Amino acid sequence: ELRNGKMKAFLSLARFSDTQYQRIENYMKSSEFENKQALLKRQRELELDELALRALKEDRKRFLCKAVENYINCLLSGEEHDMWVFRLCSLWLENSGVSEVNGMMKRDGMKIPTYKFLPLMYQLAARMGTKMMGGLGFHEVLNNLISR
Amino acid sequence: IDLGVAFEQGKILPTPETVPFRLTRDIVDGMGITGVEGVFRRCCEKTMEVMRNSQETLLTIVEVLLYDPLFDWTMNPLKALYLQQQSFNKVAERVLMRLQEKLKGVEEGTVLSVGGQVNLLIQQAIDPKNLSRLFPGWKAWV
Amino acid sequence: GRDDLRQDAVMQQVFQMCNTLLQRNTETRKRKLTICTYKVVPLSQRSGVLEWCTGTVPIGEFLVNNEDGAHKRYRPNDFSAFQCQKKMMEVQKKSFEEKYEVFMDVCQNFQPVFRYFCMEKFLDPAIWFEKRLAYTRSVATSSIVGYILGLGDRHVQNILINEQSAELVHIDLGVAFEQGKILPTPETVPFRLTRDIVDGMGITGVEGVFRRCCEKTMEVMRNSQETLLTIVEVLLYDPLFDWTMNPLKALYLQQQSFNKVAERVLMRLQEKLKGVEEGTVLSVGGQVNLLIQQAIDPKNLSRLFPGWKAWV
């Protein structure tokens, strides 16, 4: 029961963080943002925009990291929400170069039982390559996961 | 079988498919005297409501699927000619959006209940207006 | 002079149409929910004449006047408005967390005193209650209508309160249709619902009459979404309407792509009317709750322009 409670608590936190991250990403890709940037493009205002953009990217990265961590924690505990591996792998693949989600996959992503990634085998094997390397390189971690 | 065409890519084809699914007269006769008014409508609304409740999971699954490099869903003129004898990111975002309105239930900019959506789908499927326009190879009368 | 008044006139016409829609519905008609309106007669491109609302005073003049403002007669030991404005201007160039800390520090030492308006002007408890109820209802209907039309630049000097009736009148309607968010240091609130306006409502704040009037107005907005959509669509395609924000107005406020931006504004207004917010369909109560929390959030208020005077 303590495990089941942890799984639900981790899943709820992951969903909230994912919602906030998706909101930030949608605002980034939204037409209002590009319209505001174009209006700026027409000297302190440029600096203010740069600070705002940097802080927004920082918030997006923070929310993404929290969501990934909580998804990893949720998948470890039990088996009712195995289907959230789809969201987890989508977040990982889209954010290949974060170097923090890759680190968390290298450390705690390996602890996940391997059978949970089975529905995503086609896409995972399609994405995997050899361009990136290193301990935290995306391709190296993906190759290790495929091998396991 | 032959699941090559999906995600409304048949609507892009010449002589587009104008029905959500095949609900021709033979299929309706298969159910019996009650037709679509009986068990068919109830089962459709229940499965539609279930798919509505799990919209997030379906959206995530489809988003993972379409971003697969080798999936190759988008229609190209070669497949278009074979069937009836970067822009990729925009098309993917568009189909994800369309799936989102389908799961939420918004059709033609109008929010609809499960029953209303099912009724609209059935009336499109059995509509002679739509069935007449289809390709002869589709065999709507059959 | 040297100003364009056509935008104010057409905003007034849209307000009149919204008043008619509110009057038609029984639920709002019982509550006497109306939008205060005035006659604007533009005379040229840069000149015009318009009605003077007698018996009204700007809320900024009543609240934060330096010689006889409410925050000086009341709470004399608190920060002066000058110190608050100076601090908020100083923290402008700093990071967001510094902005939040400075804003909360100012708000802690600058407390609302707007509740005493009706208390001092109306000494009979029955009249005081009636005027306070009218004030709350006016705030609710003005906030909802402004959110629907995307009204912006709602600073202290752009709102008038009628001394006799205790009702709020909105002026200087140049910026609308969510164009304030395109500005530098963008506005992040649907409507002005700062601590003074909330305090003036009463001890209940937004929990009581204000929330319900917001839901009633929002429901009326929803039921008439198609007529409102047609009115706004006719309005925006006016060649002389000139609503799109341009850099000159952007610098002035803070010291064909037209078809695409117009259709974007139409879809945004349609989503507002049906209640689709951040991609999730919402009930009237849920949409009202979201709008209220976005309006009263100190996080959003801190990032605003000091000219907007969020602490006020």
Ligand SMILES: COc1cc2ncc3c(c2cc1-c1cn(C)nc1C)n(-c1c(F)cncc1OC)c(=O)n3C
């Ligand atoms: C219909 O237009 C108005 C009616 C007013 N009626 C009373 C009143 C006003 C009014 C201002 C306007 C107005 C609209 N625009 C676009 N510009 C102005 C200016 N002002 C007022 C003010 F609030 C701010 N700035 C100046 C003001 O007076 C000169 C005030 O102190 N009182 C008592």
